[model samples]
Target: QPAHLCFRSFVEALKVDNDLVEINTPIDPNLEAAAITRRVCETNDKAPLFNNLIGMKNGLFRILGAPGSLRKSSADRYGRLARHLALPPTASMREILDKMLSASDMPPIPPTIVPTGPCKENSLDDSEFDLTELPVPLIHKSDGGKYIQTYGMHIVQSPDGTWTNWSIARAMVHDKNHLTGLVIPPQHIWQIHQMWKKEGRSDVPWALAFGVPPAAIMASSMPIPDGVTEAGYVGAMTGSSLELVKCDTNDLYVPATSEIVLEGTLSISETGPEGPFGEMHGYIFPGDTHLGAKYKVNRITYRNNAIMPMSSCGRLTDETHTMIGSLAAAEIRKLCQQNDLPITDAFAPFESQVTWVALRVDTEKLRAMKTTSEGFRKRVGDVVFNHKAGYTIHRLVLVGDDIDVYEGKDVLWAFSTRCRPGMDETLFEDVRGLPLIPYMGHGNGPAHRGGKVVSDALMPTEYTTGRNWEAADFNQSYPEDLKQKVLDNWTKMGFSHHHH
Candidate 1:
C-alpha cells in the first residue's frame, strides 16, 4: 500500500520497470526541461526525472516531466499509471480501470493527520518566500509566462469546511511571491474560491502540493461528486489511510511526504493576465489572455531532495491525456453501466487529444433493446454529455462488438463505414463543453459550446439483420490451421514485414 500511497515509491517503481530516465546533466527549467519532456512523450520514451537542474541548489527540488505519459517501448504503454495503482506494469486495460474505479462504489476513506513529515525538512516563511527563484518551466514558446504549477495539486475548500477540492490547474509566475493561474468558474477550485470571496474574505486560503502520492495526483484529476473530498477518495482508492500534515500558514492539509508545498491565499479582488498557454487541444490562440486569480505565497516547504512533477501540456499523451482521459473513461463507463447502457468498455484515444471517447458496446445486447440509431445516440448523450466528465469530451463514438475501441484505426473505420454524418449523429446543441477545444476558443459559434456530439457508428440494419457483412481479411477469412501453417512458413517464404 505504501508503494502506491507514496510519491517517491511511484518514482522508484518507474525506475525499476525501466520506464524512467534520470538525467544528472544540468537542464534549465526554462523551456529546456519542458522541451525534453515533450519530446519524450512524442517518442514514447522513458520519463525524465531530472536529478540536476540549472540555477538551483542540487537537492532543493527536481522535476518529473512526462510523469504519466505513454511508455510505448515497454510491454504496457500505461506502465506508469498502472504502477501508481500498485498494479503489475503489464496490467491490461480492464485491469487498470477496475482498480482506478475501485473506490467509486464505496464510501471514501478520509486521510489521517501526521504531526510532521519530510515536507518540513526545510521551510521558507513569508519574508523569504520567492516564487521567481523556483525552477518553474516555460512549457511552450507560445505560452505567456513560466507556469510553476502545471501538475501541482491545488487544494482549496469551502468556508464551511464541508467541501475540500484537490485539482490540477496551470499557474504562471507573476513575481517574487505571486502566481497568476486559471481559477475560472465551474471548476471546483473556482467554486470554493468564490465561497470564500462571498464570505467577505479578502482572499481564499489555498495551497499547492507538488509531487504528491501517485494515487493522490490521479484522484485530483478525477471528476468525482461536487462536495466530496479527494483526500478520502484517494485513501479509498489505495485502501489505506492517506497521511496528511497541516500547512504552516493555512488550515488545510497536504500530503505528508509532498516534495513541495506552497501555502498561500488566492486574492478575491486582484486578478492577473494569464494564458496563451498551449492547451491540450494542440493549439494556442497566441496572444489571448484572461483575468486569472492572484495567488499570494506565504510559506514554501520542501523535502531535502524534492522532486516536482510537471505535465508539460501541448499535444498527445501528456498527463492531460493519460490522467484525465483514463480517469474520465472509467467514470463514463460507470455512468453508462448505471444507466443500463450496453457499454462494455470505454477508451479515450490519445490521437484525439481527449476530445473524443470511443465506447465499445455489446451490440448483441444493444440490439435486444430494440432501439434505432437515433434513440440510442440520444440516450448515450443524455447519460454521458450531462455527466461530470462530459465537459472535456467533445465526441462520443459508439462502436460495434467486433470493433476494437482500443485500436484507433478500428474506431475510425467503424465511424467511416457505419456512421452517416447527418443521420446517425446526435448533436446536443448549446451544451457545455471544454473551451480548451480549439473550436470553442477559435472556431465559429459560442466560446463554451457549439454542441456535444454522439456519433452512432453502429450499422442501421444491425438492429434487425445483425452482422450481415463479413470481413474478408486474412485473420477473419482464413481457417486457424491453414493460417498457422502460413505463419510457420512466412519467414522461410521471405516475408520480411512485422505486421500482417
Candidate 2:
C-alpha cells in the first residue's frame, strides 16, 4: 500500500533502532509539549510520542516530537533522518546524500492521482473546525504566538499551474481559520505568490499538509531549483509514482497518506504582524513583523486518530537542521557538478547549526586545473554563492579529498591545521543571505551581504604544487601486508569492527 511511505511507516521503521518513545501521560500543547521535545533534542533521546494531550481527548490527537532527530549521538546519529530518506538505520551520511542527489538527477516522476486518500477520511470546512480551539502549540516561551506550521509541508503553484514549489516555512496561528507567515521575494514560495499578484489576484492557491509521507516532507524541505516541484523528486526517491490526492479547496495535490491537510489561499496583498519568532538556529528574534502573508485555512482534511508531526525549533538539532544539513549537501554538490568544479563532496555538519558546509576538493583534479589559491577559492564562492542553495549557508570550508566531509572532527582538524586566517578566507560581500540567519539581520555589517565566507582549508601547497606528503594514519601510512594482517586478525585479536 502507498501508506508504506507515510508518516506512520517512518515511525514504525524507527523501532528498528529503538528510537521511538511514547508518552501516554497527558501533556499540554502549550509549553510543556515543546519543552519535553526540546529536552529530548538536548539529551539525544528517543522521540516522545505524545498520545495524550491535556487540551484534547485521547486517541483523537497525537503529536510526534522531533520526528527527524537522532537517538544515538555516536553509532548512528543520522539513523532516524536516514529512515526518512528510505535508507537503513545504519546508513552513513554520504549514503543519505547520494540518495538525495540521485533523486534530483533523475527525471521528474509525477505522482499518481488517487480518487481519495486517508486525508479525506475526515473533512472540516469553513467554520466546521475552529482554528483557535485546536491544539496549536505555543512552541517557545519567546515565540510571538502559537505555531501549527512547523515541520509541515507548504504547497504552492504559480498562477499558470505549470510550476509548483513545496517548501517548509513556520506559520503563526492567528484567529479562527487564519495563520501568518512571511513570503520573501527571493524564496520560491513568495515568487509563486508574486506571479498571481501580477495577474490582479489578491490570493495564491495553497495547501499545508501535516504528517505527510516521509519522502514528501524531506523533499519539501530541500532547496531544489525553482519550477521543479518536490513531488516528482519524491517519486524518484521512492522509485515509483508518489500517490497524491487533490486538495478539496485548491487545485494543488497533497500526499495520499497525509494525516492532516489544510487547503486555502495565501493573501498576496493583505498582510499581518508576525515574528519575534523562535528559529531552528537556536535563537528568538527580538521583534520581527510585517510583509507577512495571511494564510487562510479554508478547509481541513484528516484521518481518524490523526497525528501531527511537529518541530520545536531550538538548540541542539531537529527536523530543520537535519533535513537541511543532508538535503543542502546534495544540492550544493549538484551545483559543483553543474559548474564542472573540482569539488568531490559537500556536507553541512549538524554541529554548525546548518550554517557551515564542508566542500571537499579533489586535489588531484584541482591540481590538474593548475589554479591559484585565491582564484580557486573565489571560483568556489562565485559558483556556490550564486546558487539558491548557498543562501542558507554562511561558512563553506574547502577541504582536500584526504579528509571526510561527514566527519565533523576531521573537517575541523583540517580547518585548524591546513588553513590560516586572513589569507585563507575569501569573503563574498553583498551576496544574497536570508534574514533568518541571526547575524544576517542583527549584525553590525549590511544585513544581507558580508554574511557569507568561503574558507580555503585545503593543504597549504595543494593547489600550487602536487602533494609529496601523506597522513600518518593506518590507512595511509602502514604497509599493505601489515594492514592486511591486522585486518585478518582483527576478530581474533579481540577487536570489534564491521565487515572490512
Candidate 3:
C-alpha cells in the first residue's frame, strides 16, 4: 500500500505503531485538554487523540495534542519527527539534517491545482459559522483566551503575487467572528502585510490551514530565504507537487487534504486584545491594554470527522522547539557554509527553550586559520546574530569538534569547563530580539533591543594550536584496545549487549 499524505493518515500510522492513545472520556476544553498535552510532552508519552470534548457537538470535530513530542524510547527519541518526515523510526539527528540539506538542493515543483478535495466536503457560510461551536482549548490557565491556531499554517502572498509564503503564528479567538494574532515585523508574513499597507490596503488576504501534510508543516516552520515559496520547497521535500485547492472567497490556495481551513483577512485598520499565552520560551507575557492584529473569518471549510492538530508551547521539545529549532539550525548551518565558516554542525538544544544555539567548529579548519579566540568568536557571533533568523536567538556557544551540538550534556560540559566568566564571553549590545524573550524588556535595554552573549566554549589556544586538554572518560581516557577488550567480554561476563 502507498503512504498517505494527510494528517489523519499520520495519526492512523501512529495507531498502528502503538504510538498514539485515544481517549473517549469527555473532557473540558478550558485548560483540561491543554494540561494533558503538557503532561504528555513532559513525560514523553504517547500522543493524545481526544474523541469526546465538553460543550462540543459529537462528530463536529476532534482534538489532537502533543503530535510533535519526542518519542519516549531512548533508542528513538526523534521517532515521531522521523515518522513525519518519512524516515525510519531510528533516524539520528544528523541523518535528519542530511536529508533536509539534500532536499534543499532540489528545485521546488509548483503545486498542482485540484478542482475539489475533502476539505470542501462541508462548508459553513458566514451566517452559519460560529467559532464557539468548535472546542478550541484554552492551553494554559493564565492564557488570555482560547488559541486555536498554534500548529496551523497561514497562507499569504506578496502584493505582486510573485511570492507565496506559508508560516505559523499563534492566534487567539476573540469572538464568534474574529481572531487576533501577532504580526511581528521582519518575518515573511509581516513583510507581506507591510507591502499591503504600503498600497493603502487595510487588510491582507489570509487563510489558516489545519491538518496539512507533515512535510508542509515542517516547511512552513523553516526560515527559507526571502522570495522562495514554501509550497514549492515542500514539494521538493515530498518528491512531488502538493495538491492544492483554491479558496472560495479568495485566490489563495490551501492544501487539498487539510482537515479544516479558515478563510479570512488580517485586519490592518482594526485590532483586538490577543494574548498572554505561555509562549515557546516557557514564560507567559501578561496581556496589556493595547490591541493587536485582528483577523475576521469570512468562511469556514472542513471535512467530515475533521481533526484539529494543536500544540501547547511551554517547555522543551514541544512542536515549537522541535520544528522551529531544527529548521532554524539548518538555515544557520547553510548561512555559515555560504560565508566559509568552519562550522561543522549547529543545533539548539530543546532544553534551552529554543534560545541558545550551539555551533560546533571544525577544529581541523580552525587550526588552519590560526586566529585568536577573541577575534574568531566575535566574527562568528556577528555573522549569526545579524542574519535574518538571528532575531529569535539570544546566545551562541562556539564549541570544538569534540562537542556534539545536539547533546545537551556535552554542550553544557563544554560550557562549564572551557568558558571563562568574563574573558571568554563577549556581549553584542542593542541587538533586536523577539519580545517573547523573558528578559528582553525587563530593564535590559530599549523595547525589542537586548544584549546577546557569544561564549568561546573551546580552549583559548584551540584556534591557533592544538588543544592542551583532553576529556577524562571511559572512551577518552582509556586506550582503544582495552576498551575493545572490555566490550568483547561484556556479554561473556553476563552483561547484555543492549546495555552496552
Candidate 4:
C-alpha cells in the first residue's frame, strides 16, 4: 500500500522510536526553537514534539521538526527513509535504495480522484483569519518573515494543461492573503509560469500542500522532468495509485489525505520582497527581493490542528542536508541509469548539504561501452548538473560500485585521499546554477569562475592495473569468524556504545 498523507498516521504505523520528548519549556518563535532542534539533531536525541509556545495560538498550528534526522540506532537511519514510503516498519539501507531506484525507473501511475478528504475538514476564509493570529513561528531572527513553504509542495501546471510541476521552494507570508518568494525561472514551476504568461493568463492557480504522502514528498524532491506527473512515480514507488481530492477553488488535485492545502494563485503584476530566512546553507542571505513573484491566498484548508513537519536549517546531518539531499541523490542515480550510464548507486551526503552527489558505476560495463575516464566523468556531470536538482548539485562524485555511497564517513574518507582538487575536478561554467548557493558569485569567475565542481572519486580501470589503493576499513575486508567473535563479545570488551 502507498503511504498515508498525514505525518501523524505515518509516524504511528512505523513503530518508530515514539519516545517523544515533550518540551513544556516555553520557547520563542524566533531562533530558540530552531536552535533547540539543531542541538537535538547534533546529539541524535529523540524527536522533539514542541507543546508550548510563547506567542502561538493553540489551534493555529504545531511544528514537528526533523522527523527524518539521525535515529538513535545508526543502522535504522534507512528505516526512517523507508517509513516515508509506508513500507513495513523495519526497512534496511539496501531496501531503501533498491525501492527508490526501482520506482524511479517505472512510469508514473497518476493519482485517482475522490470526492472528499480530511484535508478540507477545516477552512479559513477571511483576512480576519490573519497570519498574525496564527501560531506561525519566526524560525530565525533575521528572516524577513515566517516561512510557510519549507516543507510544502507547490503544484502548478502549464496554461495549455500539458504539464504539471511539483517542487519544493522557500516562501514566506507577506500579508494576510499573499506570499512573497522566488519562483526561480529555471525550475519546473517557473517553466509552467512561463506557459501561463504565454497564454496571457495573468494569475496561475496554485496549491501549497503540506503533510502529503511521504512517497509523494520524496517524489516531489526528485528531479522528475517538467511535464511528468510525480503522482505516477509515487504510485509506482508504493505499488498503488495515489488518492487525490479536488482543491476548494482550483481544478488542481491535491493528495486527498493531505494534512493541509492552501489553495491559491500566482499574480503576474504583483511582487513582494521576502526572506533573509535561515536557508539550507545555514546562513541568512539578507536583502532579498523576488520581483513579480506573488501568490495570492484564495483559501486555506487543512485537517483540524494539523501537524506541520519542518527541517530547521543548521549544521551537518540535519534533514535539510540529509533526507532532502539523499532523496535527490537517489533520483540522480536513477537518471544516470535511465540515460544508460551504467551506474548502480549514488548519494548526496549531509556533510555537503546536497551541493554534492556521489555516484558509483560498474567499471567493467563502462569499459565495454568504450567510454574513456574523462568522457564518463563529463557525461555524469552533464546529466546530473543540467536537471532541476542539478542546479543545486554543483558537485558530483563518481565512484566504482564497490563503494558504499550511503555511508557518509566512507564517502568522506575517499574524498580526503582519492580526490585530487585540480586534476579530478570537473567544472561547468555556463549552467545557470541556483543563486541560493553561497559559493556562486562570492567565490570565482572567468579569471574568477566560482560555482560548481564534479569530483571523480572513482578510479579508472587502468589504475587497478598498477598499484591499486586499498579501502581504509569496511566489513567486507574483515575475517568473517573473527568479526562474529568481536561482535558477540562486544559487551565484554567494555565498549560503551549502547545504540547501533
Which candidate ranks first by lDDT, i.e. highest? 1
User: What is the alpha-carbon lDDT for the whole of candidate 3?
Assistant: 0.83
TM-score, cand. 3 vs. native: 0.95
Instruction: Please give the distance, in angstroms, between residue 270's alpha carbon in candidate 1 and its true position after superposition.
Output: 2.2
Go through the candidates in order and give each one's C-alpha lDDT: 0.84, 0.82, 0.83, 0.71
Ranking by lDDT: 1, 3, 2, 4
lDDT of 3 by residue, 1-500 (tens): 11235787888878886888898999888899888889998888899988888866534578889877888887778877777778887888877766666657798889999999989988987998778667898998888889998888999898899999999988989999889998886788888888888888558999999988877887788888888899888788778888999999999999998889999998768889878878887877665424678899999898788888889879765898887887788788878877888998989877678888889998889889878778887888788888876767788888998898999899888988899988998888756777777777544666576668888898867776778876799889999999999999998999972311
Q: Count of backbone clashes for each model?
A: 0, 0, 0, 10
What lDDT score is found at residue 350 in candidate 4? 72
What does candidate 4's lDDT look like per residue over 1-500, in tens digits? 33344566765544344635657778765667667777777776666666576665535566666666666675555555567766544676556656766665687777899999888788887554675556566777677887767777888877877677677777888878888877765677778877777778568999989878877776676666657777777788777888889987889999887777888898766788876766776667566544538898888888776767666776665667755677677777777888898888787877777777878767767667766557767787788777765666778887766678777777887777677888887788766675666666333553223366778776665224422655446575678798899889988989743344
Write the residue-wise lDDT of candidate 2 on 1-500 in tens digits: 43337887776766555778888898999999999999888887899888887766323468888988876556677787777776776788788778777876788898899999888888887968877778778898878778888888899988887887888888988788889987775689988888888998458889999988887788788888888878888888789898889998778999888888999989877777777677868888755555578898899898788888889877877877788776887799889978989888888887788799999888888888988889888988999888788878888999887889888889888888888898999988868886777788877777766678889888756876766688788998999999999999999989882421
Error of 3 at 334 (Å): 1.0
**Which stretches of model 1 miss by more than 4 angstroms?**
497-500
lDDT per residue (tens digit) for residues 89-169 in model 1: 777767887787888887889889999998889998888756777777888988888898888899998889898899998
